[PDB]
Design an enzyme around this catalytic site. Structure first.
Site, PDB file in Angstrom:
ATOM      1  NE  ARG A  38      18.928  19.329  51.817  1.00  0.00           N
ATOM      2  CZ  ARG A  38      19.015  19.189  53.138  1.00  0.00           C
ATOM      3  NH1 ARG A  38      18.909  20.246  53.943  1.00  0.00           N
ATOM      4  NH2 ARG A  38      19.210  17.978  53.650  1.00  0.00           N
ATOM      5  CG  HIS A  42      23.893  20.641  51.891  1.00  0.00           C
ATOM      6  ND1 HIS A  42      23.437  19.870  52.941  1.00  0.00           N
ATOM      7  CD2 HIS A  42      23.105  21.743  51.873  1.00  0.00           C
ATOM      8  CE1 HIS A  42      22.422  20.482  53.529  1.00  0.00           C
ATOM      9  NE2 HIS A  42      22.208  21.627  52.907  1.00  0.00           N
ATOM     10  CG  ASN A  70      24.559  16.708  54.690  1.00  0.00           C
ATOM     11  OD1 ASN A  70      23.869  17.569  54.124  1.00  0.00           O
ATOM     12  ND2 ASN A  70      25.857  16.893  54.967  1.00  0.00           N
ATOM     13  CG  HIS A 169      14.224  26.821  51.171  1.00  0.00           C
ATOM     14  ND1 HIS A 169      14.532  27.383  52.384  1.00  0.00           N
ATOM     15  CD2 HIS A 169      15.227  25.947  50.896  1.00  0.00           C
ATOM     16  CE1 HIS A 169      15.691  26.888  52.811  1.00  0.00           C
ATOM     17  NE2 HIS A 169      16.120  25.952  51.960  1.00  0.00           N
TER      18      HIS A 169
HETATM   19  C1  HEM Z   1      20.060  29.869  53.868  1.00  0.00           C
HETATM   20  C2  HEM Z   1      20.274  28.853  54.708  1.00  0.00           C
HETATM   21  C3  HEM Z   1      19.647  27.560  54.450  1.00  0.00           C
HETATM   22  C4  HEM Z   1      19.187  26.719  55.394  1.00  0.00           C
HETATM   23  C5  HEM Z   1      19.374  26.933  56.860  1.00  0.00           C
HETATM   24  C6  HEM Z   1      18.564  25.635  54.732  1.00  0.00           C
HETATM   25  C7  HEM Z   1      17.970  24.552  55.378  1.00  0.00           C
HETATM   26  C8  HEM Z   1      17.201  23.630  54.738  1.00  0.00           C
HETATM   27  C9  HEM Z   1      16.440  22.632  55.390  1.00  0.00           C
HETATM   28  C10 HEM Z   1      16.354  22.305  56.866  1.00  0.00           C
HETATM   29  C11 HEM Z   1      15.763  21.971  54.434  1.00  0.00           C
HETATM   30  C12 HEM Z   1      14.825  20.826  54.726  1.00  0.00           C
HETATM   31  C13 HEM Z   1      15.619  19.569  55.119  1.00  0.00           C
HETATM   32  C14 HEM Z   1      14.714  18.548  55.795  1.00  0.00           C
HETATM   33  O1  HEM Z   1      14.433  18.646  57.029  1.00  0.00           O
HETATM   34  O2  HEM Z   1      14.216  17.602  55.116  1.00  0.00           O
HETATM   35  C15 HEM Z   1      16.094  22.565  53.185  1.00  0.00           C
HETATM   36  C16 HEM Z   1      15.602  22.171  51.961  1.00  0.00           C
HETATM   37  C17 HEM Z   1      16.173  22.628  50.784  1.00  0.00           C
HETATM   38  N1  HEM Z   1      17.122  23.581  50.598  1.00  0.00           N
HETATM   39 FE1  HEM Z   1      17.838  24.672  51.956  1.00  0.00          FE
HETATM   40  N2  HEM Z   1      18.635  25.861  53.427  1.00  0.00           N
HETATM   41  C18 HEM Z   1      19.242  26.990  53.158  1.00  0.00           C
HETATM   42  C19 HEM Z   1      19.573  27.558  51.942  1.00  0.00           C
HETATM   43  C20 HEM Z   1      19.475  26.926  50.708  1.00  0.00           C
HETATM   44  C21 HEM Z   1      20.201  27.224  49.541  1.00  0.00           C
HETATM   45  C22 HEM Z   1      21.182  28.349  49.365  1.00  0.00           C
HETATM   46  C23 HEM Z   1      19.836  26.296  48.577  1.00  0.00           C
HETATM   47  C24 HEM Z   1      20.253  26.224  47.152  1.00  0.00           C
HETATM   48  C25 HEM Z   1      20.893  27.184  46.475  1.00  0.00           C
HETATM   49  C26 HEM Z   1      18.897  25.436  49.200  1.00  0.00           C
HETATM   50  C27 HEM Z   1      18.269  24.414  48.602  1.00  0.00           C
HETATM   51  C28 HEM Z   1      17.384  23.610  49.289  1.00  0.00           C
HETATM   52  C29 HEM Z   1      16.553  22.622  48.595  1.00  0.00           C
HETATM   53  C30 HEM Z   1      16.557  22.331  47.115  1.00  0.00           C
HETATM   54  C31 HEM Z   1      15.806  21.992  49.525  1.00  0.00           C
HETATM   55  C32 HEM Z   1      14.795  20.876  49.337  1.00  0.00           C
HETATM   56  C33 HEM Z   1      15.421  19.490  49.565  1.00  0.00           C
HETATM   57  C34 HEM Z   1      14.591  18.385  48.947  1.00  0.00           C
HETATM   58  O3  HEM Z   1      13.425  18.640  48.579  1.00  0.00           O
HETATM   59  O4  HEM Z   1      15.069  17.218  48.790  1.00  0.00           O
HETATM   60  N3  HEM Z   1      18.733  25.821  50.483  1.00  0.00           N
HETATM   61  N4  HEM Z   1      16.978  23.591  53.399  1.00  0.00           N
HETATM   62 CA   LIG Z   2      32.449  20.032  49.196  1.00  0.00          CA
END
Ligand code: HEM
Ligand SMILES: [Ca+2]
Ligand code: HEM
Ligand SMILES: *[C@@H]1O[C@H](CO)[C@@H](O)[C@H](O[C@H]2O[C@H](CO)[C@@H](O[C@@H]3O[C@H](CO)[C@@H](O)[C@H](O)[C@@H]3O)[C@H](O)[C@H]2NC(C)=O)[C@H]1NC(C)=O
Ligand SMILES: *[C@@H]1O[C@H](CO)[C@@H](O[C@@H]2O[C@H](CO)[C@@H](O)[C@H](O)[C@H]2NC(C)=O)[C@H](O[C@@H]2O[C@@H](C)[C@@H](O)[C@@H](O)[C@@H]2O)[C@H]1NC(C)=O
Ligand SMILES: *[C@@H]1O[C@H](CO)[C@@H](O[C@@H]2O[C@H](CO)[C@@H](O)[C@H](O)[C@H]2NC(C)=O)[C@H](O[C@@H]2O[C@@H](C)[C@@H](O)[C@@H](O)[C@@H]2O)[C@H]1NC(C)=O
Ligand SMILES: CC(=O)N[C@@H]1[C@@H](O)[C@H](O)[C@@H](CO)O[C@H]1O
Ligand SMILES: *[C@@H]1O[C@H](CO)[C@@H](O)[C@H](O)[C@H]1NC(C)=O
Ligand SMILES: *[C@@H]1O[C@H](CO)[C@@H](O)[C@H](O)[C@H]1NC(C)=O
Ligand SMILES: *[C@@H]1O[C@H](CO)[C@@H](O)[C@H](O)[C@H]1NC(C)=O
Ligand SMILES: *[C@@H]1O[C@H](CO)[C@@H](O)[C@H](O)[C@H]1NC(C)=O
Ligand SMILES: OC[C@H]1O[C@H](O)[C@@H](O)[C@@H](O)[C@@H]1O
Ligand SMILES: [Ca+2]
Ligand SMILES: [Ca+2]
Ligand SMILES: [Ca+2]
Lengths: 303, 303
Positions: A38, A42, A70, A169
């Site tokens: 993530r 970001h 973040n 995800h």
């Molecule tokens: C497409 C639009 C995206 C949105 C709107 C989005 C939004 C989010 C949100 C809200 C979370 C949970 C955060 C929380 O409330 O704790 C999350 C988790 C995550 N996202 Fe995304 N995400 C997106 C795309 C992506 C992309 C492109 C990647 C990587 C290439 C990614 C990797 C992750 C990962 C690894 C997590 C887990 C975080 C953790 O377990 O510590 N996401 N995302």
């Molecule tokens: Ca940057």
């Protein structure tokens, strides 16, 4: 002009040293893998993959990492520091924080899903990190399909690649706040989002109270099917009404996206091959190269 | 000796009147459909489909319905009484409680899954109902594949039919107690059953406390995918580690059963066609016909 093995001559051991950092971290807490993937994402969506997300706030300004999307959600900074300490003792002022983060996300893909690819390097570190740009550039989980498509086009990424990359995800977790829209006060017509399983909703309501904030430390895996394996189960789950985020469920609300999901769901190797590409491509957004920027010696602060 | 349209001459309105009873109840609370389908099942596995499960306990003996697997879980009794009141006003001492329950389960399959079939009739009501036989004859949700197969063999049902009929869990709920073995104290090696999704487990632990008993009034839908549609999603969920009962997960632990699941999951008409045959077949286990037994005027009590 980014190359695989930029450090071939200047720091031959770097990729190894980062992988060890990450591997040590992972065995303590496997959540650092999704955390670091993530982080890389970001980084790349604000000012490019330039390490800007890693900078601490000062009295001068609130940095990206302390913006709402973040903080407190982003995690993995210790790992990055530890990889960076190792590398600096080995090749001082040589390997950028930007490359370390790209490398680490790759090491996490391997650890979490056995997804093995190579990382072009030669990134340099930026000196700017603004919370206000974080807010602007990072998509929200409330985005509809069109809105997700337009963020990503904004970063020269195709819709199909948007879908591929959402498969991140397939691992990691979400705070209650991020999906609360769906389980309390969704509409005038119902409390809960109809596109989310009513059994799941009931369970999520019981785990996650109505007064939850973004600091409420209650999390839920994004992929109920294989919570810790970075695989294509995310895509199955989305088709079954088991998609957790609004932005997750968005992927079956539009024809071309909905078909990409079916294929990703239908075929593991195919998705895997695609994911490795998209994330290599993501890792090349508005990068600094040559003499541009610096080699940041401490990732948390400008030199 | 059972025929479709037994009451063609004696009570032509009966099948309709029962369907009305059931339909009215369903619209108030859709849980009566799954309730009635289970009741029919629990009738048929103790002394045959003879209405025995409907008898109240007396000061003389504890009846089936007050045994642990029936009480407090069984529900639908008011509905049956209302259909029975209707039919007795229409055709006194003519239509058996055994047929009404067979009918009602059929009406519930229609309401919940648009599954339409015809029910052979001519059953008579028994005059015996023992808790001790309920305990003996009703399989427990802790049963492994072998044990499930042997219950059903014991009632002349094929393993494949057992699998088909398990599909009834594509609707309805479970009390916490029924799957508590899986989320607390599963082994010395782990707290939770590893064949159950770790995220799901965590959510079920949060809804369902460890002190839970069979009287604890907290339920969780059997089918997280489509909780109120009687469809083949049960079978998908079982393959994705989302099967709720131990006896649900059991169905993918044996090659033969595991392939029956893939088929049910992969193909809906196939499953639907099979479920209608299995359930008609289930409704003919050790039935009483001719002059055997009686036509019970009040379902809750022997004449
Ligand atoms: C497409 C639009 C995206 C949105 C709107 C989005 C939004 C989010 C949100 C809200 C979370 C949970 C955060 C929380 O409330 O704790 C999350 C988790 C995550 N996202 Fe995304 N995400 C997106 C795309 C992506 C992309 C492109 C990647 C990587 C290439 C990614 C990797 C992750 C990962 C690894 C997590 C887990 C975080 C953790 O377990 O510590 N996401 N995302
Ligand atoms: Ca940057
Ligand atoms: C295969 C062996 C079976 C076992 C061990 C079993 C066990 C159970 C258990 C424990 C429950 C939940 C009770 C509770 O705690 O609240 C349940 C629910 C249910 N079972 Fe079964 N079952 C089996 C087979 C079947 C069959 C053959 C049918 C139908 C023909 C069926 C239909 C149902 C229905 C409809 C419910 C939902 C009840 C409601 O919502 O009121 N089951 N089963
Ligand atoms: C048949 O014999 C049973 C044991 O000997 C006895 O319990 C039955 O009680 C039944 O009768 C009562 C009224 O006398 C019904 O009450 C009804 O309840 C529903 C809502 O729950 C109302 O809609 C309705 O207006 C009425 O008050 C019971 O439903 C009924 N119970 C059962 C389980 O059948 C007795 N039956 C008769 C018809 O006398
Ligand atoms: C750093 O060393 C690597 C070998 O130790 C180079 O990778 C190898 O490049 C060969 C042709 O360049 C190719 O046949 C090998 O399969 C490949 N090995 C691996 C493990 O990828 C690397 O060269 C870069 O990577 C390749 C893929 C091309 O993009 C080259 O143009 C790159 O230079 C070396 N990197 C540098 C910057 O010297
Ligand atoms: C879905 O399940 C059906 C079972 O109810 C399959 O149809 C049956 O296929 C049999 C071949 O094994 C065949 O003898 C039966 O006539 C037929 N019954 C009916 C009611 O269609 C169906 O199989 C497909 O359709 C049939 C007609 C053939 O073309 C098969 O080759 C097909 O696979 C199942 N559908 C699928 C997509 O598997
Ligand atoms: C033998 C054993 O480990 N028993 C546990 C207990 O230690 C634990 O606190 C409880 C969880 O709520 O469930 C059971
Ligand atoms: C999945 O698609 C890939 C494309 O890389 C193909 O080579 C492979 O054979 C496919 N497998 C199946 C079972 O469709
Ligand atoms: C690196 O930078 C941060 C400033 O943001 C500082 O707090 C941290 O202790 C520094 N570490 C070292 C070893 O200088
Ligand atoms: C009742 O009527 C139907 C259709 O008219 C017939 O097919 C069925 O077999 C009849 N049942 C009896 C017992 O006569
Ligand atoms: C049913 O039980 C009564 C007493 O309850 C007894 O006299 C009668 O013979 C029994 N009939 C059948 C068919 O079991
Ligand atoms: O409505 C409640 C009602 O339920 C059953 O029908 C019987 O036990 C009655 O005695 C009671 O009055
Ligand atoms: Ca996964
Ligand atoms: Ca019986
Ligand atoms: Ca279902």
């Amino acid at each position: 002009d980014l190359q695989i093995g930029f450090y071939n001559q200047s720091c031959p051991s770097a990729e190894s040293l980062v992988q060890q950092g990450v591997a040590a971290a992972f065995a303590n807490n496997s959540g650092i893998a999704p955390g670091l993937i993530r982080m890389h994402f970001h980084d790349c969506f604000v000012r490019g993959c330039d390490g800007s997300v890693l900078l601490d706030s000062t009295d001068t300004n609130t940095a990206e990492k302390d913006a709402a999307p973040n903080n407190p959600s982003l995690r993995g900074f210790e790992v990055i520091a530890a990889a960076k300490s190792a590398v600096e003792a080995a090749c001082p002022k040589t390997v950028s924080c930007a490359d370390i983060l790209a490398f680490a996300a790759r090491d996490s893909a391997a650890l979490a899903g056995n997804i093995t690819y190579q990382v072009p390097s030669g990134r340099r570190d930026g000196n700017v990190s603004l919370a206000s740009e974080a807010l602007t550039n990072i998509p929200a989980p409330t985005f509809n399909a069109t809105q997700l498509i337009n963020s990503f086009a904004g970063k020269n990424l195709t819709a199909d690649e948007m879908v591929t990359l959402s498969g991140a995800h397939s691992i990691g977790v979400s705070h209650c706040f991020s999906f609360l829209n769906r389980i309390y006060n969704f509409s005038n017509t119902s409390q809960v989002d109809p596109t989310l399983s009513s059994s799941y909703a009931d369970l999520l309501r019981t785990k996650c109270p109505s007064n939850s904030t973004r600091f409420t430390p209650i999390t839920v895996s994004l992929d109920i099917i294989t919570p810790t394996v970075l695989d294509n189960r995310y895509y199955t789950g989305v088709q079954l009404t088991l998609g957790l985020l609004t932005s997750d469920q968005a992927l079956v609300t539009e024809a071309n996206l909905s078909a990409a999901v079916k294929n990703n769901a239908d075929n593991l190797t195919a998705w895997v091959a695609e994911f490795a590409q998209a994330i290599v491509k993501m890792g090349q957004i508005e990068v600094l190269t040559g003499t541009q920027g610096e080699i940041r010696t401490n990732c948390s602060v400008v030199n």
